Design an enzyme around this catalytic site. Sequence first.
Site, mmCIF file in Angstrom:
data_model
loop_
_atom_site.group_PDB
_atom_site.id
_atom_site.type_symbol
_atom_site.label_atom_id
_atom_site.label_comp_id
_atom_site.label_asym_id
_atom_site.label_seq_id
_atom_site.Cartn_x
_atom_site.Cartn_y
_atom_site.Cartn_z
ATOM 1 N N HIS A 66 6.096 5.129 0.631
ATOM 2 C CA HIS A 66 6.509 6.520 0.979
ATOM 3 C C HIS A 66 7.572 7.083 0.018
ATOM 4 O O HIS A 66 8.627 7.583 0.432
ATOM 5 C CB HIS A 66 6.960 6.615 2.448
ATOM 6 C CG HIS A 66 6.230 5.665 3.350
ATOM 7 N ND1 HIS A 66 6.619 4.350 3.504
ATOM 8 C CD2 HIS A 66 5.093 5.804 4.070
ATOM 9 C CE1 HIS A 66 5.775 3.732 4.306
ATOM 10 N NE2 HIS A 66 4.835 4.591 4.665
HETATM 11 O O1 LIG Z 1 2.377 2.724 4.002
HETATM 12 C C1 LIG Z 1 1.328 2.786 4.670
HETATM 13 C C2 LIG Z 1 1.339 3.535 5.817
HETATM 14 O O2 LIG Z 1 2.500 4.177 6.181
HETATM 15 C C3 LIG Z 1 0.181 3.644 6.574
HETATM 16 C C4 LIG Z 1 0.323 4.471 7.796
HETATM 17 C C5 LIG Z 1 -0.943 5.221 8.227
HETATM 18 C C6 LIG Z 1 -0.768 5.781 9.623
HETATM 19 C C7 LIG Z 1 -0.315 4.671 10.568
HETATM 20 C C8 LIG Z 1 -0.267 5.133 11.961
HETATM 21 C C9 LIG Z 1 0.256 4.251 12.896
HETATM 22 C C10 LIG Z 1 0.323 4.619 14.232
HETATM 23 C C11 LIG Z 1 -0.139 5.878 14.594
HETATM 24 CL CL1 LIG Z 1 -0.039 6.343 16.314
HETATM 25 C C12 LIG Z 1 -0.667 6.765 13.649
HETATM 26 C C13 LIG Z 1 -0.741 6.390 12.314
HETATM 27 C C14 LIG Z 1 1.081 4.247 10.161
HETATM 28 C C15 LIG Z 1 0.907 3.535 8.843
HETATM 29 C C16 LIG Z 1 -0.991 2.969 6.183
HETATM 30 O O3 LIG Z 1 -2.081 3.003 6.833
HETATM 31 C C17 LIG Z 1 -0.974 2.213 5.018
HETATM 32 C C18 LIG Z 1 -2.115 1.554 4.619
HETATM 33 C C19 LIG Z 1 -2.113 0.790 3.466
HETATM 34 C C20 LIG Z 1 -0.977 0.670 2.689
HETATM 35 C C21 LIG Z 1 0.170 1.334 3.100
HETATM 36 C C22 LIG Z 1 0.177 2.111 4.266
HETATM 37 S S1 FES Z 2 8.914 4.028 0.855
HETATM 38 FE FE1 FES Z 2 8.153 3.597 2.857
HETATM 39 S S2 FES Z 2 7.957 1.467 2.300
HETATM 40 FE FE2 FES Z 2 8.944 1.957 0.322
#
Ligand SMILES: O=C1C(O)=C([C@H]2CC[C@H](c3ccc(Cl)cc3)CC2)C(=O)c2ccccc21
Ligand code: FES
EC number: 7.1.1.8
Lengths: 107, 74, 199, 50, 127, 330, 123
Positions: free
Chosen positions: G89
Amino acid sequence: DIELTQTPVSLAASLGDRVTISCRASQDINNFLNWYQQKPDGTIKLLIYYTSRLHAGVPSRFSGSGSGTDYSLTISNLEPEDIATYFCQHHIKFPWTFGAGTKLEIK
Amino acid sequence: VTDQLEDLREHFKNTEEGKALVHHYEECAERVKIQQQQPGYADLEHKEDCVEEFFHLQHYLDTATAPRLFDKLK
Amino acid sequence: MTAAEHGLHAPAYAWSHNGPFETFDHASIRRGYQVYREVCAACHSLDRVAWRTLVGVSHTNEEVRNMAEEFEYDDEPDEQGNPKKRPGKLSDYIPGPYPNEQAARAANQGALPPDLSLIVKARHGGCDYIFSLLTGYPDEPPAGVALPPGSNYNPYFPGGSIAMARVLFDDMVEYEDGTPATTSQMAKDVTTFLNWCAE
Amino acid sequence: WRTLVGVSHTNEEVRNMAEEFEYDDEPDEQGNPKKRPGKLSDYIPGPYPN
Amino acid sequence: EVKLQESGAGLVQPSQSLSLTCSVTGYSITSGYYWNWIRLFPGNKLEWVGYISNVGDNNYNPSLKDRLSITRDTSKNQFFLKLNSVTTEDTATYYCARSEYYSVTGYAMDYWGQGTTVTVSSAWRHP
Amino acid sequence: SNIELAFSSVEHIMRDVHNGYILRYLHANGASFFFMVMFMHMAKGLYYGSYRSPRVTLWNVGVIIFILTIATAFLGYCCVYGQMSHWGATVITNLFSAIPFVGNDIVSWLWGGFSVSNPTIQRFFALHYLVPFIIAAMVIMHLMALHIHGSSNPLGITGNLDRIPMHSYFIFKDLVTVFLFMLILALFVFYSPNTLGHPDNYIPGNPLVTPASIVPEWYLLPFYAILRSIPDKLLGVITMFAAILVLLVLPFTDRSVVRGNTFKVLSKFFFFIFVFNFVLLGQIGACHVEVPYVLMGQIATFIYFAYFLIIVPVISTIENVLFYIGRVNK
Amino acid sequence: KVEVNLAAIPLGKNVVVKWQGKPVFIRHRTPHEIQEANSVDMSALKDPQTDADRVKDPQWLIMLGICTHLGCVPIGEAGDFGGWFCPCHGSHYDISGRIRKGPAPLNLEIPAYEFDGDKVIVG
Ligand SMILES: O=C1C(O)=C([C@H]2CC[C@H](c3ccc(Cl)cc3)CC2)C(=O)c2ccccc21
Ligand code: FES
Ligand code: HEM
Ligand code: HEM
């Protein structure tokens, strides 16, 4: 108050070749010895800290070294103009102490 | 056998827009040399290069060196 | 994102199999295996592909039995409790060049050559991007791009600095059928073969 | 080995026993084997190789 | 970047108080490292005067200990000289510098003031 | 579900098991269609204002289902153990650190060790088994609520004057959408099996090296966006979850006197700003945290919650008053 | 505990190693780079910290490559601060491993370490 032997008592040099000032402590200083540089306009800079290590910008042709109680300051070539008086300080304890100096002009 | 692709990239560098674009890079490649001889260049910090050019060239090549290329092949 | 960090978009070459009704070119696959065997096998594992799986696709039963036994897999200990080799069977997976992750890097300035079995899916663009990175090693690293010691330039890789030197140089493979063993024909095949491997 | 500690022995007492044997260990930078003594993290080795 | 700017009376009459000030910019007095005074003598020799730290503890030189008073203003990012009872013996150019501290490489003054020259003299100047 | 065999075993299902590739591409593409269809189902509920009494509980439960479906599909992803998997699983586990004090420990627990390691993929497999039965459990209460009030209508008036029986009309009607559903799903499954997945996932997960293209699943993107939009960790988490919860105020903030955007011009309009925002928000999720994207992201996020919390009760109150003065004498 | 060959690290090369299931970052810092780190405003900072505390010898930057946001592994020689970027992020880290832009609340953590010969014991 640890005193340091700056030497030669300011000896100039030729435009295209090296040089090598040196310091000598009245005690064991444990590489805690920096090298400074005073261009004739007055400005004083950092060149070397902890016996042997460059400061930001000072060109790689600067060297310097030593251990125990005896330390160097080997330049590579005096071009374009390294014309300044090179002081040296210990910082193994307080108060810290510079040397005499070693002014560097053209022959 | 003159490489089916090399040959096709060549022919297209030497059309109108090929000439126009190989130049655009050269003008830049020259400009780079000029900037490099100068003193304290290694500490210029924002040194130009011509990747942006280069890529604009391959795009023109690719766009033609692709739907064409494959029939020359086995 | 600077177009240099992204890598240049590989173009839409027109492959034998593109389209809803298109089987691979098995003749092409057959070539890629040779282009695989002679060239890239030197560095690249293809571990999730098994000798038998070739049979009926690129080769014939013995043709693959032949290849198979050219290598000594490990085999259950004798009555004493001491190792032994044995040739391969069709039941086997085409062995990697290196004995572990380390020697792979030792032999490549500390680079870890990707196992290729899944490459045509583990990359965006895939067939194209595979072709293009292989026929896209240009002569010199563009005006201003300063390249590290032991790294090449490729517009199709991200940030050009690829730890894999160019490897296709016309004719280095003797095309058994008798086709222009070029580099854009040496390449188009290992791609079509590597396509198969992942799908 | 660790599982002995606190039951039949004391921490070193089991560290001692542990290292009297050379378990396999991750290859050097070249890609060639090596041994190493044991850790408390290990399972008391069998007399036979198979 | 970091910058040190000297400012003060460099013409002091004997038996009085020399009083310089070092204003900084591009780092803070109250982050880290050391905040020093150093005087360059006529005979082109350098002497460490003292310091105020990043939390304001005073390591003075004992040659000058009975006679100075390093301090700081934190609202204004600056540190202060106050050398009491000035003799011509004290006449020298003055320099402010920041000295870093590492465990490994120990101290080093890497950011120096531009200089402020004082001359103890009983001469008269228009205020 | 062992961290070694995991990535490979799925390749096993792909290369070896008979029709196994059909097993995978169907599981995976299907999960997507599940999510599309579910959004369209949730859409429909906004537009015609289904969320609206007596159907609150009906509505609320679907919010629980939607939550459980995200929880489910996420775990099923973590079970491939490619790249996107191991790092997906790191971040979601890490959302819990956001919890004051105990938060890190929760994560450690939840990990069963130092990192998303082996006791992790193994519990993620087991919990992936469990949960879909929970959805089904929940689909039953969802259908019970639906049952005691019966469906609404694209007119938001009372049904009780012209009912017809689900057999054989809708049974047959529903059969049309069914086949059509399978068709597009067939299309993806046999022809475009990964036109919906991230290539980073055919790479075996590696705990030392995150990729540099972190696009998460599409049906997830709009939340990734909302999450990122917040330069604070604790708040960002909260706001991501809040992006779903806020869905529960919708029956209170709708101030109207009629259920349905159907006869509602000002309502229709913003309703499609909402839809379209939500898609944009999703586009934002795919792009890098570059400019103006971040600031665009931020604005959409605002628009998002403002639609439930602000636009809707406002507009609907106005819209009541247009309905009065737009006829009567004095 | 693990141990790195410091000599095998060129001046300006980023080295990653496996300790406790995390990655451990080791850059061999140039003096220009050393200066950037220690010539900065601790009010322009979210988790403000003197480079010289974060490091023992300033030539060696040594820290756990876990992005203190939600724990990814930051890309090296990246960002808008001559440090590291975290693709998860967008948290940007500088040349002393500390937080500048992004959601991360903290500076990249510094492990326990001891120097020994040119072997550093990262445990
Ligand atoms: O950093 C992330 C990230 O932040 C999400 C996100 C996507 C939305 C997820 C989510 C969780 C719970 C709810 Cl109720 C809705 C969305 C939270 C994680 C990912 O799916 C992801 C997949 C692969 C690599 C990195 C990442
Ligand atoms: S910025 Fe969200 S994990 Fe590094
Ligand atoms: C048909 C022939 C070959 C093909 C198609 C091929 C393909 C590839 C591909 C797809 C990558 C992945 C990089 C990426 O996309 O991110 C790669 C990397 C690499 N290859 Fe090859 N290769 C071939 C032959 C060889 C040979 C002959 C060698 C050495 C003898 C070699 C050594 C390497 C190394 C060391 C890397 C690591 C590069 C990196 O980490 O960026 N390859 N190759
Ligand atoms: C497992 C997922 C779901 C299943 C199996 C399911 C099932 C159904 C069925 C069969 C109906 C009757 C046909 C129809 O009206 O569409 C319905 C309607 C409805 N659903 Fe769901 N649904 C699901 C998800 C959701 C979600 C996620 C929500 C809200 C967040 C929700 C809320 C509603 C509401 C309020 C109605 C009444 C619609 C009307 O009045 O016509 N459902 N659902």
